[PDB]
Structure 1
Amino acid sequence: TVGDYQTVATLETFGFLPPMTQDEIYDQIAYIIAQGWSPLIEHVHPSRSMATYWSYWKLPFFGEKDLGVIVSELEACHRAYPDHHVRLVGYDAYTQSQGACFVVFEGR
């Protein structure tokens, strides 16, 4: 029906766009590393999705300059938790903030 817009539940960033291709994850990870940030993986049960602290996996990749490891550490968190959201974060140590924060896997 047009035009009847239905409110949809989203995560936050990149939520209105379709799920990312493997090649898109490559370029977002490469951008995160090229800014000098630290990657960090999280996950929750989709019901606890509004908790203030998700769950780590396993420790932030401090000083990692290779994106071929993070694309394999993302299938590990997903296979270990096939009903969890899998978030990707980019830690900024000088500002104490996050330069990136987008869900990669949505939770089967």
Structure 2
Amino acid sequence: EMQDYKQSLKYETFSYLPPMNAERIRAQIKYAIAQGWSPGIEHVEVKNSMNQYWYMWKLPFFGEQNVDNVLAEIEACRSAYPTHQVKLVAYDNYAQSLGLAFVVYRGN
């Protein structure tokens, strides 16, 4: 009755859950803006996903309050780079760390 674990590559936070849709992505962005963090968008090759430094999509959205524009920028990054993994981050300036970081598209 026991079932085996099927091994596969993972992508940090929220990678063990089913891939997020627009609603869940919007909820995460709303959380990020509610915590006072600055949303950011990054992308990199699948083979280079483990890189510490990803390609930055434009600049971090400082003071941005519209989750619709955040998601539109995510989709624009996906459209411009269709084979690249895309990550959404939230900069915490007080802690000099990231309050949230997860991939939106897992690449192909």
> What TM-score, normalized by structure 2, do the two folds share?
0.95
State the shift of 1:51 in Å.
1.0
3-state SS in 1 of match to 2:99: strand
3-state SS in 2 of match to 1:32: helix
Aligned to 1:49: 49
Aligned to 2:5: 5
Q: How does 1:52-91 map to 2 (within 5 A)?
A: 52-91=52-91
Unaligned residue ranges in structure 2 (runs of 5+): none
Q: How many residues align?
A: 108
State the shift of 1:2 in Å.
4.1
State the shift of 1:7 in Å.
2.0
Measure, in 1, the Cα distance between the counterparts of 2:24 and 2:55.
Answer: 24
Segments ≥4 residues shifted beyond 6 Å: none
CA RMSD of aligned residues (A): 1.2
Measure, in 1, the Cα distance between the counterparts of 2:2 and 2:78.
Answer: 37
One-letter identity of the residue aligned with 2:97: S
Identity of aligned residues (%): 53
Measure, in 2, the Cα distance between the counterparts of 1:106 and 1:43.
Answer: 10
